[PDB]
Amino acid sequence: DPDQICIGYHANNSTEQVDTIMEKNVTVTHAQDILEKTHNGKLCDLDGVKPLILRDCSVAGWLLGNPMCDEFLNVPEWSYIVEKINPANDLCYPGNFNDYEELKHLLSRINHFEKIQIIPKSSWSDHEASGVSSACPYQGRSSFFRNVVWLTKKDNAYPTIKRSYNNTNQEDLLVLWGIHHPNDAAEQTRLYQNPTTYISVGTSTLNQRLVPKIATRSKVNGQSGRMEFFWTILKPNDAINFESNGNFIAPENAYKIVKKGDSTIMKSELEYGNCNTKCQTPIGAINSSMPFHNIHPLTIGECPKYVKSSRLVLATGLRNSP
Amino acid sequence: DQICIGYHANNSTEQVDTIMEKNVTVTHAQDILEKTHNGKLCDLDGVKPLILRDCSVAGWLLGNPMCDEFLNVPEWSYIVEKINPANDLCYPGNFNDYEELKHLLSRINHFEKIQIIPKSSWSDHEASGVSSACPYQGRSSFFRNVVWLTKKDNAYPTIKRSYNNTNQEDLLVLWGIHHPNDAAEQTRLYQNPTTYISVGTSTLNQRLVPKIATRSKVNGQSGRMEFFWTILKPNDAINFESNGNFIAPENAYKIVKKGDSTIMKSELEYGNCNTKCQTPIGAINSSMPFHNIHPLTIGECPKYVKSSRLVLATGLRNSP
Amino acid sequence: DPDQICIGYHANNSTEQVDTIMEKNVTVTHAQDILEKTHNGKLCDLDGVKPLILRDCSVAGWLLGNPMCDEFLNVPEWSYIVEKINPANDLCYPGNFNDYEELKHLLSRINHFEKIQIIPKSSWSDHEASGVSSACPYQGRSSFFRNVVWLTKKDNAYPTIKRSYNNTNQEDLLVLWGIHHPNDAAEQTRLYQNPTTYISVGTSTLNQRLVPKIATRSKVNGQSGRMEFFWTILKPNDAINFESNGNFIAPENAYKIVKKGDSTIMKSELEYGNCNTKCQTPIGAINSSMPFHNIHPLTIGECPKYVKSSRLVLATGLRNSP
Amino acid sequence: GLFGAIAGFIEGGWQGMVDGWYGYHHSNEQGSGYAADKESTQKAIDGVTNKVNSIIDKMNTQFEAVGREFNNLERRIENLNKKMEDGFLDVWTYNAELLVLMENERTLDFHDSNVKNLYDKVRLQLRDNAKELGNGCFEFYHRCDNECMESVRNGTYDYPQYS
Amino acid sequence: GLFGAIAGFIEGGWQGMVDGWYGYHHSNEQGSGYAADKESTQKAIDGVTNKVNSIIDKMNTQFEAVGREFNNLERRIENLNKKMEDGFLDVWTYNAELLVLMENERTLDFHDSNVKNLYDKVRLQLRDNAKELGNGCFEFYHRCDNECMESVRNGTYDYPQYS
Amino acid sequence: GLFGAIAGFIEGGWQGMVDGWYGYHHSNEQGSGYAADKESTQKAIDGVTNKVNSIIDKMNTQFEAVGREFNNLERRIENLNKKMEDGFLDVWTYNAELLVLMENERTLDFHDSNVKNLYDKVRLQLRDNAKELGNGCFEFYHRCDNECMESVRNGTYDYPQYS
Ligand SMILES: CC(=O)N[C@@H]1[C@@H](O)[C@H](O[C@@H]2O[C@H](CO[C@]3(C(=O)O)C[C@H](O)[C@@H](NC(C)=O)[C@H]([C@H](O)[C@H](O)CO)O3)[C@H](O)[C@H](O)[C@H]2O)[C@@H](CO)O[C@H]1O
Ligand SMILES: CC(=O)N[C@@H]1[C@@H](O)[C@H](O[C@@H]2O[C@H](CO[C@]3(C(=O)O)C[C@H](O)[C@@H](NC(C)=O)[C@H]([C@H](O)[C@H](O)CO)O3)[C@H](O)[C@H](O)[C@H]2O)[C@@H](CO)O[C@H]1O
Ligand SMILES: CC(=O)N[C@@H]1[C@@H](O)[C@H](O[C@@H]2O[C@H](CO[C@]3(C(=O)O)C[C@H](O)[C@@H](NC(C)=O)[C@H]([C@H](O)[C@H](O)CO)O3)[C@H](O)[C@H](O)[C@H]2O)[C@@H](CO)O[C@H]1O
Ligand SMILES: *[C@@H]1O[C@H](CO)[C@@H](O)[C@H](O)[C@H]1NC(C)=O
Ligand SMILES: *[C@@H]1O[C@H](CO)[C@@H](O)[C@H](O)[C@H]1NC(C)=O
Ligand SMILES: *[C@@H]1O[C@H](CO)[C@@H](O)[C@H](O)[C@H]1NC(C)=O
Ligand SMILES: *[C@@H]1O[C@H](CO)[C@@H](O)[C@H](O)[C@H]1NC(C)=O
Ligand SMILES: *[C@@H]1O[C@H](CO)[C@@H](O)[C@H](O)[C@H]1NC(C)=O
Ligand SMILES: *[C@@H]1O[C@H](CO)[C@@H](O)[C@H](O)[C@H]1NC(C)=O
Ligand SMILES: *[C@@H]1O[C@H](CO)[C@@H](O)[C@H](O)[C@H]1NC(C)=O
Ligand SMILES: *[C@@H]1O[C@H](CO)[C@@H](O)[C@H](O)[C@H]1NC(C)=O
Ligand SMILES: *[C@@H]1O[C@H](CO)[C@@H](O)[C@H](O)[C@H]1NC(C)=O
């Protein structure tokens, strides 16, 4: 019957749980999840810009112009690059790409090339420029890389080559060339006539002299021969000078670096998702206002911070009485 | 009449630290830091380590004659090498990509050494070169697993050999080149003055050329030998061609057990003991979550920290 | 009328603010700043030892003796080394310095060299030993590096050189030499007579055999030729043996490594400050009792700990009432 | 709880108070009901909101892994690169999890504190004019009408008037 | 401590209380003895046990150094490698030591709170029927035999009957 | 604050008390003045001085960046080096900022706790012999002399005398 006043606190039907150091699974009236745990399982445009999806082609295969990669002969601007773990279409003619990983690292800061013809096939009068291999088929006929040219002897003669290119453009130029390593001495003379050869390359900074390596090697894509490729960045107004008396796989096209920016090479088996996002990972895009996520540690865009947690939940309310 | 409220006090002198106060006496505490080890190199969970004693990995693998103890070592848990092993390259020179090779070793528990090119197959070359640099029983000898080919009948015809890895395991193949002191020694040993060694696999495309140079004597010799290695995949083949200076394979190593291993640098030798957790200065038998013995451990170990002391309060402030 | 005793707490005129997790800008009676935010803008001696300020010279220019770097022919003991971002006097004759970054890394552990002669000019009876280039001007005329010598043919002959130096000193010795890469074969015979050449170098550990590279190259500082320099550390009682029949840039002077300790190479545009400190930064010196600072991450000396914080203040006193 | 009020001397919470986190139940002649204490509730909202934002903002300059590639004879630096990136991911993962745990504990004790301080606000006002039941309630000696009840929540209860 | 009980209004601890961390000391016509409050002692052990275990589990994915070797011309990466590994060792050593220091403080305060809360549990039940001594004790006005001594420990003291 | 005293039931601090952090205001027929409590003020200075020292000493071992140079075909390791050093700087910047925020919170609460315990020390000595106003003051039933007031600060208030 007498009047009274009581002090108390809020309870509700919440079953939300949080953890503390001294106690787990504490029921609270309110809690705030701060961990994004879901993704759309797709590769998307990044803030309106489509990526470069290399499909079955490698970076090497793309840049050298493996015939199987004609899809990527003059790609438009990209937001990022996707490459499979082991692309099928790489060096069709076997060998290697020198400092390949350092070249890939450059791409991570590039969004666009304008590929240009710097030395036309038609300009080789005293040499054959039409060399092909069954290792690089195109529509079932032997072919060769599109951006370089396999030079061989003409009328049992390989006169010493001397060609220069001056980068009269305003952009840095990525230039590619290579050397052919034959199987034996008989092959050497059959292709190039001269038994002892070299390729020398010079710019303002590059000072290269390559000598072929004759050796009997195991067949790869039908070939025991190898081709070894090289690259440099030719500055505006610098010139590149090639000299050779054999084994020279010469440039045809080179790439103007027209757009530098943030990019990356993701390894993913996924295909293009016809979709747009602000945060992309190799296994899916993220659309979240959460401050953390646990999707994948490699992301690009405006993203939450990655953590390995299976669960992050902050108490906001108080301990809820059952 | 009177009910009092109070708390446990005891005779404890165990002390703990907090932000605001050091050396706080409490009724109960718990040390969580292992501070002792047994000072020994032990078997890791029943599996003995490979103690290389005075031999280096290089001396072991190439077959330095002072390392004959390790001609066919059993399966190991970890590898122990001294800081500066006396028995390394007996014939002076270097091992190409040596550190990368030792990195692979850290994931290998066992090799099975096999012959891949018998001495008998050298019809047109001498295959018994030796040096006072590689004494066996104080007499001139050579590495056991590679062969020093020299001219025969004042001739060194062009060598051409293949070995196809028909085994099921990856194969570690080793070979070398000899760098002579002068043009006269070149002709004396190999006859031909301008020589090469080409080596090819599915991935390797190597051409080595020797380097005459005037050099300081090491182990009595001014000549050098440079050694190379590759991993030969099942069903791949390796192709050697040479017209001089070739230190050719005799034996190679099947990689028959991959797993967790390491190369510890330690001057200790075998402790005839067993442990679940091993460091280069000794082994740990403990249920503490932390230890400060040494940062490089192998096995099931507490977590390492540089601390000298780590004690959690469990009980309460102990009044005197 | 009735007597009273009250419990209370200190207040004052302090306007000092600190932060907590739940509350920013909390005014407190006492606080302690623990972050140093000021420096003197100068390069100073470190605890009485002056730095080596290379002014417009690079480490390469210094050690090889670019003629514009004569200021540094015999520098005294230093505490740290200061280099500009793009020093004008580097390799006057263009080319490159092999393992340059690894050499600079050794410099970080050295405080003093004593330079010494290892091969006098008087030993070149059968070669010319005064080759110079307009790429290495000094007082408006063609000159050359001071510490190495450009050998060329004499009386239309270049006999094979054999030279040894035994390190009879107690200290390790930094030895430098180079190779000249010419423009064409005509130049090769014009300078050295022998058309096919080499340089062989050996010690107890070194086993080198260099061969020059003709290649057509862009002019840098007027020259299309290049010079490539090498170095090694020669232990006491070991010896180095050079042999060459052309293209050899020979040692004249080498550097005894006389004092080893803590040092570093700072990149800075600042000049000497006529000033002393116990903690130095490429941007200015620090004199402070604060345990932390935010001046620059690269410091040498007795320094506070660097953080990127703009502010760090500990509360010591209590919440101050208005 | 550290401060002994939540699930302590006040045995349980009120589902009837949908209004704020802490507050009052009154019963008198005119009726009965719940009312949130707005000051303490607003204080708690601000502090908790600040805490949540602090935690997010402190992590804002976190480590961000980058894809790097290495060839077959760069295994040592590939392993170095991998353990470095994992190393930081493990550091930041730990920082986030521990911070959340530590602050969850403080947040629950903060609520406990606020409830105890609200109880003491009322106790110190009423003094001898109400009996302290020991369960969070005060039993008045005099009759406290709605205006009198409002004054207790205002912090404007006039003790001289009733003793 | 923060709660003012341990080495506070209760001057010191009891050697006689072997059977628990917190408890009672009664004295009536029948006799006197120490009795440990199981509810609070148990809560304490659970809380403390969970704290220790959590501290261990958070550090259970921590940095593990790996021997890597480098040659004479790989000094930069060798140094990079060494600084990276020392870096993580220092970070994890800091985390470990700091967490122990912070949680040792919270542990001692936890006990203090538990003793304070226990005292109030007794106080709030008794009210007028006992006199607050101030040393952590209550002198009864009405005699309390060994049955009501158990009811106050049980938490089942009927105030109305004694006043 | 957590303990309800500072900016709580004691509404403000005193400019008048220059002599220490916590203390007393008295009023008797002789005169009225300010007296700091030595023991509690000193305890607080020790704990706060230690806290500061502890924070510094835990950060005395910590990452130190080193200038490393790389050439045009070592961009990957250069990048790796950069991210590694930035990585540790960020970790340590976080460690410092966060520890200060957390310890600042605790420092203010520590002061609040100390004020409260001091209020309680006085309260428990007086009991009946003074009136609890609720604002931080104790209105005396009897007349407390200059001597009487000093026994309170000593902690030697003879209660049996005045009742
Ligand atoms: C007459 C003729 O060319 N027939 C073709 C067969 O050669 C071919 O069989 C493959 O032949 C491979 C080697 O031949 C090529 C090649 O790679 O395709 C022929 C190229 O024209 C030649 N290109 C140049 C510029 O010389 C190329 C080159 O000489 C070497 O690669 C240099 O190392 O050699 C090889 O033996 C394969 O194993 C074999 O299958 C068949 C089937 O594709 O088609 C015929 O038209
Ligand atoms: C006559 C004779 O040979 N006597 C022996 C001495 O040779 C030897 O003194 C050492 O001689 C070294 C050079 O000799 C070898 C060697 O390395 O030991 C002899 C090897 O049979 C020869 N092997 C081959 C396959 O050619 C080897 C080889 O030519 C070089 O190593 C290639 O660089 O040369 C050298 O001069 C030492 O300084 C010297 O001590 C003594 C010492 O026990 O024994 C004599 O029987
Ligand atoms: C023309 C001439 O012989 N000497 C003077 C020129 O130096 C100079 O014009 C420059 O000529 C440069 C090439 O000539 C040098 C040089 O680098 O300066 C002349 C050096 O004596 C010679 N040194 C040696 C040891 O042989 C050097 C050397 O052959 C090459 O560097 C090896 O590659 O060549 C170059 O073309 C410059 O572009 C040009 O300006 C003029 C005044 O400028 O006076 C000439 O008398
Ligand atoms: C809790 O109450 C809400 C109504 O506000 C309801 O949506 C929710 O389902 C309830 N939880 C249950 C029934 O478990
Ligand atoms: C609560 O924690 C337990 C173990 O502590 C866990 O197994 C469980 O999944 C958690 N939540 C549940 C059952 O909803
Ligand atoms: C490239 O072209 C311009 C003239 O069009 C010239 O100034 C420049 O020297 C050339 N670069 C080189 C390296 O020859
Ligand atoms: C207590 O700490 C002091 C310094 O704070 C230290 O020297 C000593 O080792 C500790 N206690 C004992 C009993 O040694
Ligand atoms: C090695 O032998 C296998 C089985 O006979 C064969 O199929 C394979 O092609 C050989 N490898 C090479 C590289 O020739
Ligand atoms: C604040 O007070 C101190 C002494 O109590 C005095 O020295 C100082 O000048 C004052 N500052 C201001 C701005 O009033
Ligand atoms: C107080 O904090 C606010 C942001 O909350 C800031 O804008 C203001 O400048 C701070 N006062 C300072 C730094 O004196
Ligand atoms: C260098 O000279 C010293 C001093 O006589 C001698 O002992 C040493 O063998 C020599 N070393 C070489 C490599 O010639
Ligand atoms: C740093 O500053 C103080 C105060 O101006 C000055 O007196 C002292 O000499 C300086 N210390 C050094 C090492 O330069």
PDB file of C-alpha atoms in Angstrom, chain E residues 29-157:
ATOM      1  CA  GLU E  29      26.473 -18.069  22.027  1.00  0.00           C
ATOM      2  CA  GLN E  30      27.112 -21.486  20.405  1.00  0.00           C
ATOM      3  CA  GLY E  31      30.551 -20.723  18.979  1.00  0.00           C
ATOM      4  CA  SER E  32      32.644 -19.191  16.224  1.00  0.00           C
ATOM      5  CA  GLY E  33      34.147 -20.309  12.919  1.00  0.00           C
ATOM      6  CA  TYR E  34      35.183 -19.483   9.386  1.00  0.00           C
ATOM      7  CA  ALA E  35      32.820 -20.392   6.520  1.00  0.00           C
ATOM      8  CA  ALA E  36      33.616 -19.880   2.815  1.00  0.00           C
ATOM      9  CA  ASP E  37      30.922 -18.369   0.573  1.00  0.00           C
ATOM     10  CA  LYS E  38      30.807 -20.964  -2.202  1.00  0.00           C
ATOM     11  CA  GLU E  39      28.757 -18.892  -4.699  1.00  0.00           C
ATOM     12  CA  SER E  40      31.290 -16.034  -4.919  1.00  0.00           C
ATOM     13  CA  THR E  41      34.375 -18.259  -4.615  1.00  0.00           C
ATOM     14  CA  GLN E  42      33.086 -20.465  -7.459  1.00  0.00           C
ATOM     15  CA  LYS E  43      32.269 -17.472  -9.670  1.00  0.00           C
ATOM     16  CA  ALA E  44      35.833 -16.276  -9.039  1.00  0.00           C
ATOM     17  CA  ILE E  45      37.516 -19.530 -10.052  1.00  0.00           C
ATOM     18  CA  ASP E  46      35.432 -19.778 -13.226  1.00  0.00           C
ATOM     19  CA  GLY E  47      36.201 -16.184 -14.148  1.00  0.00           C
ATOM     20  CA  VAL E  48      39.920 -16.567 -13.421  1.00  0.00           C
ATOM     21  CA  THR E  49      40.210 -19.980 -15.127  1.00  0.00           C
ATOM     22  CA  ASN E  50      38.556 -18.580 -18.273  1.00  0.00           C
ATOM     23  CA  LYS E  51      40.840 -15.537 -18.225  1.00  0.00           C
ATOM     24  CA  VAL E  52      44.012 -17.644 -18.152  1.00  0.00           C
ATOM     25  CA  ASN E  53      42.751 -19.950 -20.902  1.00  0.00           C
ATOM     26  CA  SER E  54      41.667 -17.025 -23.149  1.00  0.00           C
ATOM     27  CA  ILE E  55      45.072 -15.374 -22.780  1.00  0.00           C
ATOM     28  CA  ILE E  56      46.728 -18.623 -23.904  1.00  0.00           C
ATOM     29  CA  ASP E  57      44.336 -19.214 -26.858  1.00  0.00           C
ATOM     30  CA  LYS E  58      44.781 -15.701 -28.302  1.00  0.00           C
ATOM     31  CA  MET E  59      48.580 -16.177 -28.446  1.00  0.00           C
ATOM     32  CA  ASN E  60      48.197 -19.646 -29.975  1.00  0.00           C
ATOM     33  CA  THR E  61      48.706 -18.312 -33.531  1.00  0.00           C
ATOM     34  CA  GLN E  62      51.790 -16.196 -33.028  1.00  0.00           C
ATOM     35  CA  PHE E  63      54.934 -15.650 -35.101  1.00  0.00           C
ATOM     36  CA  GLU E  64      57.313 -18.570 -35.602  1.00  0.00           C
ATOM     37  CA  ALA E  65      60.835 -17.828 -36.798  1.00  0.00           C
ATOM     38  CA  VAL E  66      62.444 -19.883 -39.533  1.00  0.00           C
ATOM     39  CA  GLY E  67      66.156 -20.270 -40.255  1.00  0.00           C
ATOM     40  CA  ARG E  68      66.923 -18.857 -43.706  1.00  0.00           C
ATOM     41  CA  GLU E  69      70.441 -18.643 -45.153  1.00  0.00           C
ATOM     42  CA  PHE E  70      72.006 -16.024 -47.366  1.00  0.00           C
ATOM     43  CA  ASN E  71      75.354 -15.565 -49.089  1.00  0.00           C
ATOM     44  CA  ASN E  72      77.987 -12.800 -48.995  1.00  0.00           C
ATOM     45  CA  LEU E  73      76.283 -10.741 -51.721  1.00  0.00           C
ATOM     46  CA  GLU E  74      72.786 -11.066 -50.225  1.00  0.00           C
ATOM     47  CA  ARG E  75      73.452  -8.899 -47.197  1.00  0.00           C
ATOM     48  CA  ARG E  76      70.530  -6.525 -47.770  1.00  0.00           C
ATOM     49  CA  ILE E  77      67.897  -9.298 -47.811  1.00  0.00           C
ATOM     50  CA  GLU E  78      69.720 -11.101 -45.005  1.00  0.00           C
ATOM     51  CA  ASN E  79      69.368  -7.917 -42.944  1.00  0.00           C
ATOM     52  CA  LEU E  80      65.747  -7.423 -44.079  1.00  0.00           C
ATOM     53  CA  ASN E  81      65.045 -10.993 -42.975  1.00  0.00           C
ATOM     54  CA  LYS E  82      66.634 -10.515 -39.573  1.00  0.00           C
ATOM     55  CA  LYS E  83      64.738  -7.259 -38.909  1.00  0.00           C
ATOM     56  CA  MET E  84      61.454  -8.784 -39.973  1.00  0.00           C
ATOM     57  CA  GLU E  85      61.867 -11.719 -37.589  1.00  0.00           C
ATOM     58  CA  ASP E  86      63.127  -9.654 -34.655  1.00  0.00           C
ATOM     59  CA  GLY E  87      60.243  -7.316 -35.473  1.00  0.00           C
ATOM     60  CA  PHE E  88      57.587  -9.942 -34.885  1.00  0.00           C
ATOM     61  CA  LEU E  89      59.413 -11.356 -31.848  1.00  0.00           C
ATOM     62  CA  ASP E  90      59.376  -7.881 -30.259  1.00  0.00           C
ATOM     63  CA  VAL E  91      55.718  -7.291 -31.147  1.00  0.00           C
ATOM     64  CA  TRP E  92      54.637 -10.654 -29.652  1.00  0.00           C
ATOM     65  CA  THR E  93      56.837 -10.153 -26.591  1.00  0.00           C
ATOM     66  CA  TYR E  94      55.175  -6.777 -26.059  1.00  0.00           C
ATOM     67  CA  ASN E  95      51.693  -8.263 -26.512  1.00  0.00           C
ATOM     68  CA  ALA E  96      52.403 -11.057 -24.029  1.00  0.00           C
ATOM     69  CA  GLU E  97      53.975  -8.955 -21.293  1.00  0.00           C
ATOM     70  CA  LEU E  98      51.419  -6.132 -21.612  1.00  0.00           C
ATOM     71  CA  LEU E  99      48.430  -8.452 -21.553  1.00  0.00           C
ATOM     72  CA  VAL E 100      49.788 -10.079 -18.405  1.00  0.00           C
ATOM     73  CA  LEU E 101      50.304  -6.660 -16.771  1.00  0.00           C
ATOM     74  CA  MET E 102      46.850  -5.354 -17.689  1.00  0.00           C
ATOM     75  CA  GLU E 103      45.028  -8.542 -16.697  1.00  0.00           C
ATOM     76  CA  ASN E 104      46.894  -8.873 -13.389  1.00  0.00           C
ATOM     77  CA  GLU E 105      45.531  -5.463 -12.492  1.00  0.00           C
ATOM     78  CA  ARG E 106      41.994  -6.438 -13.499  1.00  0.00           C
ATOM     79  CA  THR E 107      42.332  -9.738 -11.589  1.00  0.00           C
ATOM     80  CA  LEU E 108      43.265  -8.092  -8.269  1.00  0.00           C
ATOM     81  CA  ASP E 109      40.444  -5.560  -8.741  1.00  0.00           C
ATOM     82  CA  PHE E 110      38.084  -8.461  -9.546  1.00  0.00           C
ATOM     83  CA  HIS E 111      38.716 -10.027  -6.163  1.00  0.00           C
ATOM     84  CA  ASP E 112      38.252  -6.622  -4.497  1.00  0.00           C
ATOM     85  CA  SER E 113      34.898  -6.207  -6.230  1.00  0.00           C
ATOM     86  CA  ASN E 114      33.830  -9.709  -5.183  1.00  0.00           C
ATOM     87  CA  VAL E 115      34.584  -8.972  -1.528  1.00  0.00           C
ATOM     88  CA  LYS E 116      32.782  -5.607  -1.712  1.00  0.00           C
ATOM     89  CA  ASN E 117      29.752  -7.236  -3.402  1.00  0.00           C
ATOM     90  CA  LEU E 118      29.617  -9.980  -0.743  1.00  0.00           C
ATOM     91  CA  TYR E 119      29.691  -7.402   2.085  1.00  0.00           C
ATOM     92  CA  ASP E 120      26.821  -5.487   0.491  1.00  0.00           C
ATOM     93  CA  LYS E 121      24.826  -8.732  -0.005  1.00  0.00           C
ATOM     94  CA  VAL E 122      24.943  -9.208   3.762  1.00  0.00           C
ATOM     95  CA  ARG E 123      24.397  -5.495   4.515  1.00  0.00           C
ATOM     96  CA  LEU E 124      21.349  -5.129   2.244  1.00  0.00           C
ATOM     97  CA  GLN E 125      19.638  -8.147   3.851  1.00  0.00           C
ATOM     98  CA  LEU E 126      20.154  -6.996   7.463  1.00  0.00           C
ATOM     99  CA  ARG E 127      19.496  -3.223   7.455  1.00  0.00           C
ATOM    100  CA  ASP E 128      18.265  -2.083  10.917  1.00  0.00           C
ATOM    101  CA  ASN E 129      18.553  -5.492  12.606  1.00  0.00           C
ATOM    102  CA  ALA E 130      22.373  -5.204  12.660  1.00  0.00           C
ATOM    103  CA  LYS E 131      24.845  -2.367  13.297  1.00  0.00           C
ATOM    104  CA  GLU E 132      27.461  -1.572  10.631  1.00  0.00           C
ATOM    105  CA  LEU E 133      30.856  -1.772  12.395  1.00  0.00           C
ATOM    106  CA  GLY E 134      32.975  -0.412   9.535  1.00  0.00           C
ATOM    107  CA  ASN E 135      35.754  -3.021   9.816  1.00  0.00           C
ATOM    108  CA  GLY E 136      33.841  -5.418   7.545  1.00  0.00           C
ATOM    109  CA  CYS E 137      31.593  -6.638  10.336  1.00  0.00           C
ATOM    110  CA  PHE E 138      28.026  -6.510  11.652  1.00  0.00           C
ATOM    111  CA  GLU E 139      27.126  -6.515  15.352  1.00  0.00           C
ATOM    112  CA  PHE E 140      23.634  -8.027  15.665  1.00  0.00           C
ATOM    113  CA  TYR E 141      20.949  -6.316  17.778  1.00  0.00           C
ATOM    114  CA  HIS E 142      18.887  -9.517  18.082  1.00  0.00           C
ATOM    115  CA  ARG E 143      20.767 -12.742  18.912  1.00  0.00           C
ATOM    116  CA  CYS E 144      21.526 -14.948  15.890  1.00  0.00           C
ATOM    117  CA  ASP E 145      22.016 -18.679  16.544  1.00  0.00           C
ATOM    118  CA  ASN E 146      23.816 -21.043  14.106  1.00  0.00           C
ATOM    119  CA  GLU E 147      20.610 -21.451  12.040  1.00  0.00           C
ATOM    120  CA  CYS E 148      20.152 -17.816  10.945  1.00  0.00           C
ATOM    121  CA  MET E 149      23.922 -17.604  10.405  1.00  0.00           C
ATOM    122  CA  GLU E 150      23.268 -20.174   7.651  1.00  0.00           C
ATOM    123  CA  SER E 151      20.213 -18.275   6.325  1.00  0.00           C
ATOM    124  CA  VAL E 152      22.235 -15.087   5.814  1.00  0.00           C
ATOM    125  CA  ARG E 153      24.930 -17.149   4.017  1.00  0.00           C
ATOM    126  CA  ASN E 154      22.217 -19.042   2.095  1.00  0.00           C
ATOM    127  CA  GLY E 155      20.637 -15.657   1.267  1.00  0.00           C
ATOM    128  CA  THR E 156      17.340 -16.485   3.001  1.00  0.00           C
ATOM    129  CA  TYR E 157      17.217 -14.071   5.956  1.00  0.00           C
TER     130      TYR E 157
END
